[PDB]
Design a protein around this ligand. Structure first.
Ligand SMILES: CCSc1ccccc1
Ligand SMILES: CCSc1ccccc1
Ligand SMILES: CCSc1ccccc1
Ligand code: FES
Ligand code: FES
Ligand code: FES
Ligand SMILES: [Fe+3]
Ligand SMILES: [Fe+3]
Ligand SMILES: [Fe+3]
Lengths: 446, 192, 192, 446, 192, 446
């Protein structure tokens, strides 16, 4: 397939070829043009707070070690020995000043440097150039309010610019709330879906909630519960959708601070978020304070998703075109009482974790939609994302980005796939930029 | 068991061993086997309301954890060692049961098929609460659906059972430390 | 079990439950365990003639079905719900046994290896035929052959056993509703 | 591999490259040139007799919904939602006036039309063109005496013409018997063989029976039993072989009406078939009435096979070059007593079903012959099908098609693979026809 | 069992059958079940020193073989029929235990997870050594490590157990003829 | 990938691209340029000593039957029927005068000839040319002191020349000891590693022993035990490394006759080897008699490895780029007492068999190093084998080949990969020779 020419995503992101969820050659191409090029979620300050603390993380199909340095910075390195390529670290988290390879005993520092080689003097003499044998380092590592992302491509925009218009929406909860903590360890489960299936669902799919999650809505006694079985449509003005230049986007459901949490947490959460909102009015204004306690379903392009207020935090780690390893963490506000944080974390896993009853509702949808992308008669068929097209705006006086002023639509699908196509057809960041110079105009046509 | 000598044994595991090695009551092991076989039968036929009514105590904690992989020699890193795949009280189990029984649970059509294999049953009365029964057992759980989906779960279960209404022994605690860190079964949406 | 409340339970499954929840006879469960363990041993060592002679009643119906996947809410479509993977009388089992033992059964060289795991044994006398014993048990059956072929079968077995010649209890009915709709084991050529 | 030029099947179908059973690129090419082009078995009238009745079926690797319409016709559609590609139907059979997608709730009629979209007015307004969003329909659906076949290619010959000379042989049992019923549900088992391995075996392989099925012949007390261990050769005139332009072919074993059925059914069957034969003599003549009660081992190209009289009906559903999903139904004559139909159906599964002891004899043969096609030193080796070559006739006064007047030979292999090669090297039906204008001459050379 | 009639049965297998079909002692089967369940618990929690001390006799032969695939009709080729995956005396088991417990056994970090399922227990006293107990049982052994590595072993175990120090019954022989010829579990580094 | 031009192994074998352990296209290319071209281990005289004795063996991914002929020679044939390609033999060893196919009953002799065809006269008449239908024969089968190797390529050098300079080192144990026997049957286990990972480890990796095998060294009480946890370095002059033109190489650890065997065999072995060494001094000289009782870790290119004295004999049978089937035999000296042979064989399996505790130490190293070769950021990375470079010699007065006069180094890696690259970039033996005309000069540069 010629990725320079092949139209995988139509103009304005209105449709995508179904093969994108199934084609293994395209998956391999994505490793280069999506995962090796873009910002990927690694960890949070709260999981590696002290010097020597480290975790392992996936970046695409590669594995990295993510380590807190003595100077307080974070550096990340391929989890691969520079000698004969053995996997250096076999655990998920810990604290160490270095990592020793179990094959021939080479010792690397937390700073990636080759610090020791067994019997170096007797064996290599002075001939081993250790300065050139440090672990392969992730070129870019940046933080968004404690949330640590990495990028293999030195040419990437800074993480803040990469978030584009989505940053404005995330800031009330990520910054102005006093800060979030990630509660680990994550749940980890393999699903037989393409990584794009859950990514697209979290970025912009409010339409599916009433029908897909009918049983969870009816049973689980949450606030979004009126929607069960499409019994009711959210009223006009119930929310909006947004998307951005570099692909990130989200839905906003006004006031939904208790999210998917069952009735046992609803009064406590609604009291807590409302109290903080009252304080934030004076600091960031009424609209942004309201956004703080509004439910955001967001994907940070390409494969990191979240539900704020519900507190669900996801990484859709790619394995092959029909296999994805799902990592599920909980996010909590630092200034919540500890007992509430504990119950919120359990509730995140209860609803969206490995035995998450909500998340289970999505399995067949995402697995079969992905697997159908391999089927002969469906490869060249068109997946539709035209809902709300022709009613999106850009440059709004209050809400930034490409915005659909309705709670349910496919605005965020369109921006996600516009960015996806621009990357797949580009050889580098400069080409992506050239392919994106009229990004918002394309999305708001008609 | 001296865990200073038996280096791979956790303090928790050594304590649980001690419980069964002492007083051995054959009749209790047989009662426990019956209790667990009947529980597994109710679950296998998806009689989830019957399971709650007959097998599950009002004060239950039903917990399955997933433990983060850490170095055997790790002694500095102290953050949360595990997450809860399940950590349910009775009302939370009821929510999950209602979710299973809801006619708009699309994943349950066509009807799933469950087969459970319960082995290695051990039973001992608590030394301090003479009405508290400790039961340990291992489960293989086979779930088949949708023509060619087959998921097999494997776990050890540390239970506490106590006589409730009508004198019927019911589950007041189940603890499972799930042995596979990354699930390869699509989800853990089964009652172990 | 009220199947109007426990929506996922079939009438057949609810009836089979009722059988074991009532009169519980520990000695009978132990007899049943012995009967099934000895049967599984004979099958595992491929003593198929001995199995027929010692374990199988002359009036046997040996049945394994595969049920078509239908909607949980289906109430109009009425055609054959299942096919018979097995539905054998004694003479038909004998044909299958002779086929296994034939020296020109090329698939049996090199010799197959079978290992059976029988669990969850329950037993109850019939309320109306006091010589009819109901036995329920689950089986994991592992079949290995030809270096790297490995097939594992999982099933629940509803049996009826009755005293025959010499007073030896023998199988007069086995019913298995096989839980996987599409077999991923090359065939179902094993005696469950 | 260049499929226009590569000789995969030699002149006259005398040999095939062993790689054809193992090569995954060729398997992918077959999805286009074999499965998307030819007629494939779907279901029978008896399984969807009433309006609203439907089943799912595979057509190649695609899945379709096959539905009885209100007007009594049958239409078939891809089992894929037109919105974002989720699998619409997850059951195997039922009765419904429509199918609702579990993802966003789109509702399709039994006629494939997009009939409803949740909250369409509020969400899409008048902008959703539902008339253009019907399920992707199988272009051609035709019946051969109740047996329903589908074809994705509008340009295909009518099913009757496609059966070619094989139709004449099938008609006594399929038509003149008063009609057949298919007894469902089918057994379903995955084998590690190429779909062509069982297809070629059923189309023309009488040679294997005495040796492969020695143990089943000896143990199972059927009529073909003299053959066990090659103890005896069928006498001269015991049967014949035929093949046809579009690839279908069969063996005929004269008078073998009880087929593989054990002695417990032999007297009853031989009485029943003989009685009907006596009536049919006056209607269709002695030869064709004899064919009615003669055992036919047939493959309807490409992947539907059957044994008439034995009543075995097979679909070899392709998964990959070494994986096939075997569907096994029973066929019975409608006017048989119900108790006989029931016992015949059980006997079909007993012999050729998932635990079919006859079918088990074939496993290793078909799996290893297929898997050897991937082995380096065997890829370019030649599978032989030359038995009987130079003794086939065409245009016989009594028996039509390319015919070998002997019970055991490879006549039907040659015609099957001649058609296969003509399809693999052609881009469309017109090219197949051009490549087949001297089909019978090629098969009867020497 | 007549092995001239039951053509697929080996002389060894027919002899082992005869052992259990005769005198049946229910109490002995129960003792054997306890012995094996406790052994499996010690192994599952990786209390390998405790296993040696409590379960393994000083005179033990611990043997697992892999048999070469030969024709069913083979009667001329006479060379070594099997190799020993294990054939350990007590000191050799101790070496393996020390290897497991060594802090530089890198493969044991992060800590492995074991779950054993013991079924089909049969027990009979030796007819000539009244202190020798024959125990047969089948094991499914699940080993999980390193996030997504999962290996499942299946075997039948022919054991001899004898009272040793303190009158504690200990393993003096275990024999396993491993049913899969080519291992698909990375290794057989587990105690069956 | 263009294998004529792609530098997979750098000059002097100093590094290799990590993709070589993971790339499936290269694996397929290796089937042609490595496995179909080179000598591969089949069996030993001791396993097929009598006329009619046969075993099956893998040669690359192909399976062959290896049969003792009536004249005492050995011939080998593809285990594939010449009719329709079924696997002929399904057992691992036996004795027969021929092999009959279970599909249509064709009978082949132990000499590969098609000897019988069921009902040939009635079916084929005189038209079947059986003389042209013999099993596909392995072109070359040669013995090195009872050890039988095969090669599909008629143009290969004789086995003795192919062993090159490595033969001199093997001869004291293989020839002058009175001869070795292979004790079967082998252990067989699948590992998730590339075949090159264990091959490179056995050919030249003494560096890993102290660290990888720390626990086995400490626990298992062998002679090499001082090395546990890199507690001690072998003294100067403790051994050497060698490599050869056609890729074979080994390490020599002086005097280590008891090898990895536990203390229970050490005194007996050290007595036995020393006694034979005293006799051999007078026959082959002190140096070569010392080599006899010195531990050799050797790979016979490409995928046959051994530890002499330890008695471990390995075949790393390739399945795909990350899957290898490991066959483990024991080697013993024929004139050892039978009881010692039995205990030595058990000890070989105890240490390096399917439950070999030493071999288990290597699993993660070889599996992860292989699997990392598929990871995007590691494919183009360089595996290092530069230890000892610039200190190797050729043409030494005492020790032949390219030799590093130190016990620990990567001399044998360099020669192994030099030969590997020369084969991968060549279309035939003549091209390999042209690419190897300055082989030792390349290895001893600087
Ligand atoms: C996941 C896309 S939208 C959404 C809203 C609420 C809960 C869960 C999801
Ligand atoms: C299957 C090809 S020929 C044949 C004849 C009779 C029964 C079964 C098969
Ligand atoms: C395997 C490479 S070196 C070596 C030496 C001794 C034992 C095992 C291996
Ligand atoms: S591979 Fe890491 S030290 Fe050699
Ligand atoms: S995918 Fe079917 S309604 Fe959206
Ligand atoms: S395939 Fe071997 S005889 Fe036909
Ligand atoms: Fe959802
Ligand atoms: Fe057949
Ligand atoms: Fe090693």
């Amino acid at each position: 397939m010629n990725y320079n020419n092949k139209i995988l995503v139509s103009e304005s992101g209105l449709s995508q070829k179904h093969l994108i969820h199934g084609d293994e050659e395209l998956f391999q191409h994505e490793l280069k043009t999506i995962f090796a090029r873009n910002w990927l979620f690694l960890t949070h300050d709260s999981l590696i707070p002290a010097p020597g603390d480290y975790v392992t993380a996936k970046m695409g199909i590669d594995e990295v070690i993510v380590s807190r340095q003595n100077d307080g910075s974070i550096r990340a390195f391929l989890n691969v020995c520079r000698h004969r390529g053995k996997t250096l670290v076999s655990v998920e988290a810990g604290n160490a000043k270095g990592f020793v390879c179990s094959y021939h005993g080479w010792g690397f520092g937390s700073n990636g440097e080759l610090q020791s080689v067994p019997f170096e003097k007797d064996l290599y003499g002075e001939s081993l150039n250790k300065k050139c044998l440090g672990l392969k380092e992730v070129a870019r590592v940046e933080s968004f309010h404690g949330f640590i992302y990495g990028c293999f491509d030195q040419e990437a925009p800074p993480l803040m610019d990469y978030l584009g218009d989505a940053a404005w929406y995330l800031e009330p909860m990520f910054k102005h709330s006093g800060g979030l903590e990630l509660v680990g360890p994550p749940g980890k489960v393999v699903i037989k879906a393409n990584w794009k299936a859950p990514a697209e669902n979290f970025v912009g799919d409010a339409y599916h909630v009433g029908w897909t999650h009918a049983s969870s809505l009816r049973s689980g006694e949450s606030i979004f519960s009126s929607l069960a079985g499409n019994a009711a449509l959210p009223p006009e003005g119930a929310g909006l959708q947004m998307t951005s230049k570099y692909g990130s986007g989200m839905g906003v459901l006004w006031d939904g601070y208790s999210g998917v949490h069952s009735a046992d947490l609803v009064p406590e959460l609604m009291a807590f978020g409302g109290a903080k909102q009252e304080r934030l009015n004076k600091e960031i204004g009424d609209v942004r304070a309201r956004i703080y306690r509004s439910h955001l379903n967001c994907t940070v392009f390409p494969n990191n998703s979240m539900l704020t207020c519900s507190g669900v935090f996801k990484v859709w780690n790619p394995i092959d075109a029909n296999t994805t390893e799902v990592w599920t963490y909980a996010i909590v506000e630092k200034d919540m009482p500890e007992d509430l944080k504990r119950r919120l974390a359990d509730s995140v896993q209860r609803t969206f974790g490995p035995a998450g009853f909500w998340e289970s509702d999505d399995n067949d949808n995402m697995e079969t939609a992905s697997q159908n992308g391999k089927k002969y008669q469906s490869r060249d068929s068109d997946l539709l994302s035209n809902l709300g097209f022709g009613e999106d705006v850009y440059g709004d006086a209050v809400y930034p980005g490409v915005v659909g002023k309705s709670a349910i639509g496919e605005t965020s699908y369109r921006g996600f796939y516009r960015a996806y196509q621009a990357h797949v057809s580009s050889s580098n960041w400069a080409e992506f930029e050239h392919a994106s110079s009229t990004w918002h105009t394309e999305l708001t046509k008609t | 068991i001296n865990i200073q000598e038996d280096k791979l044994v956790s303090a928790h595991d050594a304590e649980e061993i001690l419980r069964f090695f002492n007083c051995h009551d054959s009749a209790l092991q047989q009662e426990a086997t019956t209790l667990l076989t009947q529980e597994a039968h109710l679950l296998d036929i998806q009689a989830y309301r019957a399971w709650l009514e007959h097998c599950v105590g009002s004060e239950v904690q039903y917990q399955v954890i997933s433990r983060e992989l850490r170095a055997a020699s790790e002694r500095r890193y102290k953050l949360n060692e595990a997450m809860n795949v399940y950590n349910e009280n009775f009302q939370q189990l009821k929510v999950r049961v209602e979710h299973q029984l809801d006619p708009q649970n699309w994943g349950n059509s066509p009807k799933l098929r469950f087969t459970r294999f319960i082995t290695n049953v051990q039973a001992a009365m608590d030394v301090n609460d003479k009405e508290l029964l400790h039961i340990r057992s291992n489960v293989i759980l086979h779930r088949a659906r949708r023509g060619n989906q087959v998921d097999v779960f494997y776990a050890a279960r540390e239970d506490k059972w106590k006589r409730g209404e009508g004198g019927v022994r019911k589950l007041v605690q189940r603890f499972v430390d799930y042995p596979e860190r990354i699930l390869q079964t699509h989800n853990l949406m089964v009652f172990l």
